[PDB]
Scaffold this active site. Structure first.
Site, PDB file in Angstrom:
ATOM      1  N   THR A   1       0.891  -1.373   0.273  1.00 31.28           N
ATOM      2  CA  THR A   1       0.133  -0.016  -0.111  1.00 31.28           C
ATOM      3  C   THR A   1       0.698   1.284   0.004  1.00 31.28           C
ATOM      4  O   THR A   1       1.873   1.204   0.655  1.00 31.28           O
ATOM      5  CB  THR A   1      -0.879   0.000   1.236  1.00 31.28           C
ATOM      6  OG1 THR A   1      -2.046  -0.721   1.034  1.00 31.28           O
ATOM      7  CG2 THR A   1      -1.390   1.479   1.371  1.00 31.28           C
TER       8      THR A   1
ATOM      9  N   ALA B   1      -6.587  -4.072   6.130  1.00 30.97           N
ATOM     10  CA  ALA B   1      -7.796  -3.728   5.491  1.00 30.97           C
ATOM     11  C   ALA B   1      -8.939  -3.540   6.507  1.00 30.97           C
ATOM     12  O   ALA B   1      -9.607  -2.418   6.330  1.00 30.97           O
ATOM     13  CB  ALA B   1      -7.975  -4.781   4.334  1.00 30.97           C
TER      14      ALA B   1
END
Lengths: 121, 222, 204, 233, 196, 222, 212, 198, 196, 198
Positions: free
Chosen positions: G1, G49
């Site tokens: 990410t 997440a």
């Protein structure tokens, strides 16, 4: 353990304990507040049932909740201390969580809630 | 892996499944777990693939040299001794588990060898993760004095028990028959009960589907 | 930790009609850090091809080792080595290090110059030989490759079709793997010619 | 979190055309010591259900009480206790499954593998399994522990798929199961020669057979086995 | 494993169960734990199958070479070769071995070589995981110079009890009789000894 | 020490069509190297045209489906039998899963149905609740084998228009139920070939405005 | 990410990637890492997440409640401190989240707060968060000026995430752009790296290594 | 770790190496030169374990110089890097492996082109337009992926480095005390003594 | 520890050695492992002295209260209280207990409660570290409904063998006879049982 | 760790605190102010665990301000430091202890003297002419042990700090990105905005 319902409805739909609470306020020394165009003033009267007090130490009638907000009252003195302490505590907490001091309306709403809660607990 | 050994009236037969694995993935859907140590001495191997193969070739090679040196047919006991002493020398680090069988001038033989070096003798044996599924069949249908045909059926049925009930086993059944007076017969893929059904569609792509960046010819000639 | 996941990379080989294909990605990273996008994993000695996935240092070493061995083989044998033979050489070379193995996943591809027969083979790190008639996968995205191949594949594809199929298997497999991709090369091998192509693929 | 002390080995079972059969030996092991021998590991609930239990015996005894309490409880204020509102095999299982999964979830499992065998009121055969993790499943054959590895392979040869059930008679099935028990006595070092077997048939009801013994064993070839390779005598 | 060797009036008898396990699985139910290292010197093996097999195989080799050079070896000498192997390699072996032999002058002799590698010459000895369960039984039922029949019975009874309580023991009971008369192999089946 | 988790294998997959959706899974249930059952349904009709499957540790999977179905039941009580939209079911399942954030349900779950516009819809989840709506998704043991295939054949990844020099991407036409079923079958027969925990049978649940239909196909049993 | 947010003359630029992984497995290339808390507040997600996505959705709930209660939009500072204090109550439990709360308010102006599951809360002009942060910082830091045109700042951001998508095995998929001004945020598209990379390579002439 | 950077431009290779030498709580030196010249047109930079670092660099220098004297010739940079990779590859499986990473920058007088090789302690070798060992790579790779061109001049390269060094002084945790820059080209190796403010 | 309880024609007899150790040291050589929980319900303790004492003390308290309320408790009931305590606290106890009682209608009863907390009603039971050595002996010498004399002898022989082989057992052998006639305490010394 | 310095001169207390905030491989901020004003004449600096740091400083600030409002008076620095030590002492034996070290610099308007208190996360409190938390103390204590005088002026104190900061920028491993200096005296608290080159 003690949980008796002290504030309850009577036939005509009144909560006598709350009403008698106002009677205690009616008996209290007078307090007034007037807002100008760039300020607000609070004035309170001092009883005279006994005079020979030490005005330096005797608790005043106008309390600072925070540095930009004050509170005055009429009614039982002992009771007011409790409301003032709670409001002060809340003022510090609000500064901590919202990172901004309380608005007068917010601080007011808090104090009023505490009173309401004590009418149905 | 499911490998077995079964003696019959005039010889010995061995069988094995054909699945190879790396964790839960089938590495090879049809490897050969049956190895020839000499023309009439065959070995069924389980455990660490490369180990069974390497140890099988090494002893096989030495058996050939010994045979040539003595002008005699190799004996199953010789393979058994050379293997076990080797495996023992390695304190079980060579993950080989084998069933060694065959016919020689002294008769027919059925043995098993474990990674640490111990050997066993019997009329019916099984090794590998399918070991128990197979053995249950053997313990259920083996009888003394079986015919070459009966033995093959029993062995083959045992392997299937593993193929169907052991996730570590599957695909086909390989067999090798060693009869006292004949040439050994190796039956690669004696059974193929797991043929993949016809696919639903063809995924043949229209030429030009893949984006190419550059191209060229490669020189192979020196 | 796991030597086979430090650098990343994948290789895949397929058989077709009188032809064989072998392909690989071009990534060479260190954990998450992509370092080189030009690290090819396919090599060849004569007409025999070898792809190697795993620890880059071992990939380079094995290549240099096999060049060395195949060169002497040619000098003494007076002929280039064949795929079947090379496979054995690869297998014994690996097992020679059974207890301190090279962390690689070799793949051999080629056409036997005498029989004309196409040949492909895979190996585990200590030499176990897997000789498939259809395909061979290897690398950090080997699961994805098994999925792509078992689906996309079909026997006797023409060189032009096999190219499409082996490329789609590689490309889609690498895109589901953080450690593979960053470019790719495909080899289409026939008895007479060998074509090399660099595929266009995602760069993330 | 615990560790089993006294334990029961395999529990095997299968269904045939008119019912189900379930068996388990009478041994209560203590490590490698075959300590107790009169241990009934098959628990009948009513006359339409038999619960076979393997694993920790003290835990088994606890589940036995739970089962009997269930029978007592179900009768309370229940005029149809032995009719329309009698315990169904399916009720007994769901209960046990519930208890098993709750216990593993509190990290204090009942260290057992359980098979519930019986016949539903509509005649349907009932066979389901649940273990100390709360996992559950059904199959034409079911076995715990060692029996999963050696018994199933055998039993599945008789009932390999649903369409095989109606073609299987009690005789065939009981024979398959009795044979599996012999096989387990051959290769499981924590087994006993004595066992119990029960039949739950939609027509004959519950037949509970106690004190059976493994018979017709092959051992004669053992005399021909000498040495471990080269020894000749 | 349940093994024992007993000296009696005419020589000595070795006995053993026939079970070999890998955990709770019986890898072999008809194992022959009675191994020959010389014409009239045998041993009972317990512990690691791989270890005891490798040791017995080596002892046999040593006694064969001994015989080629200096004639027949005594039972004591065989127990000494075993002991030397077991002591010197104590860190890498798990072999509990009983050595029994018949000699014309000494009649029957029994030497037990436990885990550490020490040697103990006794009238009889028991060993193996199953032995623990028959310490009291054997101590209360052994007598010196029993007859061949009384000894076979003592061993048959003792081992049936060992097999009864030890999950690592079982199968058939094997015996080997060693006397001036030669070598006799005996085998007893479950149906016979279980109901003793 | 006590390990409260297990792995029961299997694999599942969901494909979304223009006016339908499918959720399929094999019917094999395993423990280590043994088969517990060749037929133990894993995909369920939860009502309101919503199908779901929580694959992984079966005990956890069942608990989840059970808790969700119970949520649907109460939704009907609390909101006058109002149908629960699939996007709503997804948010609910996230709370069910994240509710056990510190002692998770060892499952990979997928649900299929139709969005509020009648279009096919597939939602998949994290063992702890992270979810996304997609056109297709494989979950479970062979997920890594199937997903790539789906990326290619359902979303035409890495596919271009021939001759256009890899400049024009293959358009995103949409799959019909007949074509979707082919991919599902080919996806599973492939997974069944290389993954030992996948096999025995394939059960597909198709969802349309008219409801939920089922189709069953056998898979190799080795 | 990889996620970044920087303040400049034209307000604030927010760019994120869209990749999700579980080990080396690329779980997804289509995750929405930006949450539109409300017409004027954005939240970025890095780390776990479910953790980000669940707790930030919850944050949106708390924010909305604040407005219903105070008849006024929640401040960026206070929104970030709600998440901060929540996450701190969970310190030691294993929550994983590197987050950025970005917004505009007449009273604060363009504002950005970095908030991680460690309890760290920081106000700043530039922040790159995630396994790809360093790669983004490398490009962003060396081309940042307080005077970029809204159009140039938009590209710098996009290009910065592209850089990380390329070099970080754990970043990729597509880029999601946002611009924050006093009239709230303005979405500026989803740019799939599959085409963005080659486009930038040709047009800009960078990524000179990779051969095309 | 220490900073080890290398960038190959049009006609030369430039290496930059941090000057700090920190041990535990104290920075002991701030002018350390983490480099050894292997031959007149080949320079090697290094980082890694406290003792292995120099022992390895010097051991290699000795061997390349020995080859130079014996053959009265200078090995190509490609040949030198291969010798270095071999030595490290042996090391990795030895009793006590050398824990050293290196960058090899040389000018191949025969091909007349600059070359840069990156080699880690595992014996992983790769040729690149620019490289780095340690954490620096996490900031500099994408930087150069952006600001790099093949035909750049040496002067352009030095600016490209200045750009990298600044990013490192801004974002890296440790105080590496600046770098020492050296250029390798057709005329040999020289040090840019003025980078502390170039 | 070596403990056992045997039912016979007239009731039941409990037996035990008298050794308590802390390692290889004998903390007590004259321990009384035969504990009374009711007039005719006693138990044999093995395992942790602290744990079994605490459990017996509690069982006694429960039976005393039971008696106050519902009269005499059955031997089964006593075995149930022990079992409840042992099962429910299995994670913090190391108590191998034998429960034996004499009842007019049931005569003698024996319940063994092993480590896990399960209960087993048997004709007789043996327990303790020393029990392993007499499994075969006891299985071969026990008979139902023996006489008081035959039972005392069985227990005396069995326990002398257990004491002989187990270092954790020894001292004197104690017995408690429970019959309709009352409660009789018996004690046997080394000089007597060692030479049996 | 971060740098937390405090020095009490003739009529004031000066606190210096590093401006860096580094997380792993990246320096996230370089202008962080590691301080909270507890009252008009009492300042507290802090260093320690990522979250505990601010949560503790603010929790205390809230309490001191609350005491101020309720009593319409400012507690002495000695009283404040005692309240702080008590809170940390409770913490050390709680489920999850605050991992925070602090320096408390205040001007006692009643005694008319500056005061400096050093308190670690264990609740260890000591009053000193100068103090530091973390590794800084290993360089600054002997420095001040040499260059420190009781009657020094505020200006002399700032030079004494400059001396400390330079030593730290020379010998410390990490790049703490300079410090922020604040002065506490009879007129309250103020920040020396010009120290980045004073």
């Amino acid at each position: 353990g003690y949980d008796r319902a002290l504030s309850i409805f009577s036939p005509d739909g009144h909560i006598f304990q709350v009403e008698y609470a106002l009677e205690a306020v009616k008996r209290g020394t007078c307090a007034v507040g007037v807002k100008g165009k760039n300020c607000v003033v609070l004035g309170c009267e001092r009883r005279s049932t006994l005079k020979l007090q030490d005005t330096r130490i005797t608790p005043s009638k106008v309390s600072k909740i925070d540095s930009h907000v004050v509170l005055s009252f009429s009614g039982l003195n002992a009771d007011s201390r409790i409301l003032i302490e709670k409001a002060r505590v809340e003022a510090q907490s609000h500064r901590l969580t919202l990172e901004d001091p309380v608005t007068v309306e917010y601080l007011t709403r808090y104090v009023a809630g505490v009173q309401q809660r004590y009418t149905q607990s | 892996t499911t490998i077995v050994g079964v003696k019959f009236n005039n010889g010995v037969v061995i069988a094995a499944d054909t699945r190879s694995t790396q964790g839960p993935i089938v590495a090879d859907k049809n490897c050969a777990k049956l190895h020839r140590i000499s023309p009439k001495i065959w070995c069924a191997g389980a455990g660490t693939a490369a180990d069974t193969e390497a140890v099988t070739q090494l002893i096989g090679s030495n058996i050939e040299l010994h045979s040539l040196y003595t002008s005699r047919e190799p004996r199953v006991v010789s393979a058994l001794q050379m293997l076990k002493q080797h495996l023992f020398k390695y304190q079980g680090h060579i993950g080989a588990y084998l069933i060694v069988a065959g016919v020689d001038p002294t008769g027919s033989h059925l043995f098993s060898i474990h990674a640490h070096g111990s050997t066993d003798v019997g009329y019916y044996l099984s090794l590998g993760s399918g070991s128990l599924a197979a053995m249950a069949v053997l313990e259920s249908h083996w009888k003394q004095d079986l015919t070459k045909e009966e033995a093959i059926k029993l062995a083959s049925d045992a392997i299937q028990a593993g193929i169907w009930n052991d996730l570590g086993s599957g695909s086909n059944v390989d067999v090798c028959v060693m009869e006292i007076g004949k040439d050994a017969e190796y039956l690669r893929n004696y059974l193929t009960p797991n043929v993949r059904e016809e696919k639903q569609k063809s995924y043949k792509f229209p030429r030009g589907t893949t984006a190419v960046l550059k191209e060229s010819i490669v020189n192979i000639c020196d | 930790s796991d030597p086979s996941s430090i650098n990343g990379g994948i290789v895949v080989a397929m058989t077709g009609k009188d032809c064989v294909a072998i392909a690989c990605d071009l990534r060479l990273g260190s954990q998450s850090l992509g370092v080189s996008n030009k690290f090819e994993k396919i090599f060849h000695y004569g007409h025999v091809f070898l792809g190697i996935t795993g620890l880059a240092t071992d990939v380079t070493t094995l290549n240099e080792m096999f060049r060395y061995k195949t060169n002497l083989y040619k000098l003494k044998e007076e002929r280039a080595i064949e795929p079947e033979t090379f496979t054995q050489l690869v297998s014994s070379s690996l097992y020679e290090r059974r207890f301190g193995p090279y962390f690689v996943g070799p793949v051999v591809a080629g056409i036997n110059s005498k029989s004309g027969k196409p040949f492909i083979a895979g190996f585990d790190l200590i030499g176990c030989i897997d000789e498939a008639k259809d395909f061979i996968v290897s690398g950090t995205a080997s699961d994805q490759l098994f999925g792509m191949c078992e689906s996309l594949y079909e026997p006797n594809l023409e060189p032009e079709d096999l190219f499409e199929t082996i490329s789609q298997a590689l490309l889609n497999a690498a895109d589901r793997d953080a450690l593979s991709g960053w470019g790719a090369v495909v080899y289409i091998i026939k008895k007479d010619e060998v074509v090399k192509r660099y595929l266009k693929m995602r760069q993330d | 979190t615990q560790q089993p002390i006294v334990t029961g080995t395999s529990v095997i079972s299968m269904k045939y055309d008119n019912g189900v059969i379930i068996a388990a030996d009478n041994l209560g092991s203590y490590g490698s010591l075959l300590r107790f021998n009169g241990v009934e590991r098959l628990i009948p609930v009513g006359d339409n259900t038999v619960v076979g239990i393997s694993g920790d015996i003290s835990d088994m005894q606890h589940i036995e009480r739970l089962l009997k309490d269930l029978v007592t409880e179900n009768a309370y204020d229940n005029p149809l206790a032995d009719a329309e509102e009698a315990l169904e095999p399916s009720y007994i299982f769901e209960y046990l499954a519930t208890v098993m999964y709750q216990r593993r979830s509190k990290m204090n499992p009942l260290w057992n593998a359980i098979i519930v065998a019986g016949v539903q009121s509509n005649g349907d055969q009932f066979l389901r399994y649940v273990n100390l993790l709360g996992v559950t499943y059904s199959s034409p054959t079911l076995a715990t522990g060692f029996g999963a590895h050696m018994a199933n392979p055998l039993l599945r040869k008789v009932v390999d798929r649903e369409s095989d059930i109606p073609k299987t008679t009690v005789q065939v099935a009981e024979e398959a199961i009795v044979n599996a028990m012999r096989v387990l006595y051959y290769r499981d070092a924590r087994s006993s020669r004595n066992f119990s077997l029960a039949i739950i048939d939609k027509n004959t009801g519950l037949t509970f057979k106690k004190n059976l013994q493994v018979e017709n064993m092959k051992w004669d070839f053992a005399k021909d086995i000498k040495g471990y390779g080269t020894q000749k005598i | 494993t349940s093994i024992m060797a007993v000296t009696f009036k005419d020589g000595v008898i070795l006995g053993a169960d026939s079970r070999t396990t890998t955990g709770a699985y019986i890898a072999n139910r008809v194992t022959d734990k009675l191994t020959r290292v010389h014409d009239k010197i045998w041993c009972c093996r317990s512990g690691s199958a791989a270890d005891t097999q490798a040791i017995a195989d080596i002892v046999q080799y040593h006694l064969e070479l001994y015989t080629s050079q200096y004639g027949t070896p005594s039972t004591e000498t065989a127990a000494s070769v075993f002991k030397e192997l077991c002591y010197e390699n104590k860190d890498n072996l798990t072999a509990g071995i009983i050595v029994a032999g018949y000699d014309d002058k000494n009649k029957g002799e029994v030497y037990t070589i436990p885990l550490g590698g020490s040697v103990h010459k006794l009238p009889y000895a028991i060993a193996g995981s199953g032995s623990t369960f028959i310490y009291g039984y054997c101590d209360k039922n052994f007598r010196e110079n029993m007859s061949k029949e009384e000894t076979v019975d003592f061993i048959k009874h003792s081992l049936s009890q060992a097999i009864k309580w030890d999950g690592s023991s079982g199968g058939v009971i094997r015996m080997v009789v060693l006397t001036a008369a030669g070598v006799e192999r005996l085998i007893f089946y479950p149906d016979e000894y279980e109901q003793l | 020490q006590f390990n409260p988790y297990g792995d029961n294998g299997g694999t599942i997959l969901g494909i979304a069509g223009e006016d339908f959706a499918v959720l399929a899974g094999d019917t094999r249930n395993i423990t280590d190297y043994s088969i517990n059952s060749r037929y133990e349904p894993k995909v369920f009709d939860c009502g309101d045209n919503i199908v779901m499957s929580a694959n992984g540790f079966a005990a956890d999977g069942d608990a989840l489906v059970k808790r969700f179905k119970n949520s649907v039941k109460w939704y009907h009580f609390d909101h006058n039998d109002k149908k629960l939209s699939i996007n709503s079911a997804a948010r609910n399942i996230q709370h069910l899963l994240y509710g056990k954030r510190f002692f998770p349900y060892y499952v990979h779950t997928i649900i299929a149905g139709l969005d509020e516009d009648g279009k096919g819809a597939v939602y998949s989840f994290d063992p702890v609740g992270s979810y996304e709506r997609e056109q297709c998704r494989a979950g479970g043991a062979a997920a890594s084998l199937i997903m790539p295939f789906l990326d290619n054949q359902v979303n035409f990844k890495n596919q271009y228009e021939p001759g256009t020099n890899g400049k024009v991407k293959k358009p995103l036409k949409y799959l019909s139920v007949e074509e979707v079923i082919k991919l599902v079958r080919d996806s599973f027969t492939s997974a069944t070939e290389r993954h030992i925990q996948v096999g025995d049978g394939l059960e597909i649940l198709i969802v349309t405005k008219d409801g939920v239909r089922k189709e069953f196909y056998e898979l190799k049993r080795d | 990410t990889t996620t970044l947010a920087f303040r400049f003359q034209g307000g604030i630029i927010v760019a994120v990637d869209s990749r999700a992984t579980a080990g080396n497995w690329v779980a997804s290339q289509t995750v929405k890492k930006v949450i539109e808390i409300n017409p004027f507040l954005l939240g970025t997600m890095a780390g776990g997440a479910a953790d980000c996505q669940f707790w930030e959705t919850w944050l949106g709930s708390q924010c909305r409640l604040h407005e219903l209660r105070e008849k006024e939009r929640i401040s960026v500072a206070a929104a970030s401190k709600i998440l901060s204090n929540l996450v701190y109550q969970y310190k030691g439990a294993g929550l994983s989240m590197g987050t950025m709360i970005c917004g505009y308010t007449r009273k604060e102006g363009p504002t950005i707060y970095y908030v991680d599951s460690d309890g760290t809360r920081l106000k700043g002009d530039i922040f790159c968060v995630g396994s790809g942060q360093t790669f983004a910082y490398g490009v962003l830091d060396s081309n940042y000026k307080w005077d970029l045109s809204v159009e140039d700042a938009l590209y710098l951001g996009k290009r910065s995430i592209l850089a990380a998508a390329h070099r970080d095995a754990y970043s990729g998929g597509s880029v999601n752009l946002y611009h924050v001004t006093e009239d709230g945020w303005i979405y500026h598209g989803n740019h799939d790296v599959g085409e963005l990379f080659w486009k930038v390579k040709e047009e800009e002439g960078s990524f000179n290594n990779v051969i095309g | 770790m220490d900073i080890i950077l290398g960038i190959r431009v049009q006609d030369s290779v430039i290496l930059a190496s941090s000057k700090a030498v920190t041990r535990g709580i104290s920075v002991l030196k701030d002018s350390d030169d983490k480099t050894r010249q292997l031959s007149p047109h080949t320079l090697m930079s290094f980082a890694g374990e406290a003792g292995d670092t120099v022992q390895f660099a010097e051991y290699i220098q000795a061997n390349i110089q020995l080859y130079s004297i014996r053959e009265d010739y200078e090995l190509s940079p490609q040949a030198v890097s291969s010798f270095v990779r071999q030595e490290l590859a042996k090391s990795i499986r030895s009793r006590r492996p050398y824990q050293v990473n290196v960058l090899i920058g040389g000018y191949d007088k025969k091909k007349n082109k600059p070359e840069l090789y990156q080699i880690d302690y595992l014996g992983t070798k790769v040729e690149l337009p620019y490289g780095a060992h340690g954490y620096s790579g996490f900031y500099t790779f994408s930087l150069l992926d952006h600001h790099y061109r093949p035909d750049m001049t040496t002067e352009e390269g030095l600016d490209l480095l200045k750009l990298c060094v600044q990013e490192l002084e801004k974002r890296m945790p440790m105080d590496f005390k600046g770098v020492i820059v050296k250029i390798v080209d057709k005329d040999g190796i020289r040090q840019v003594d003025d980078f502390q403010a170039q």
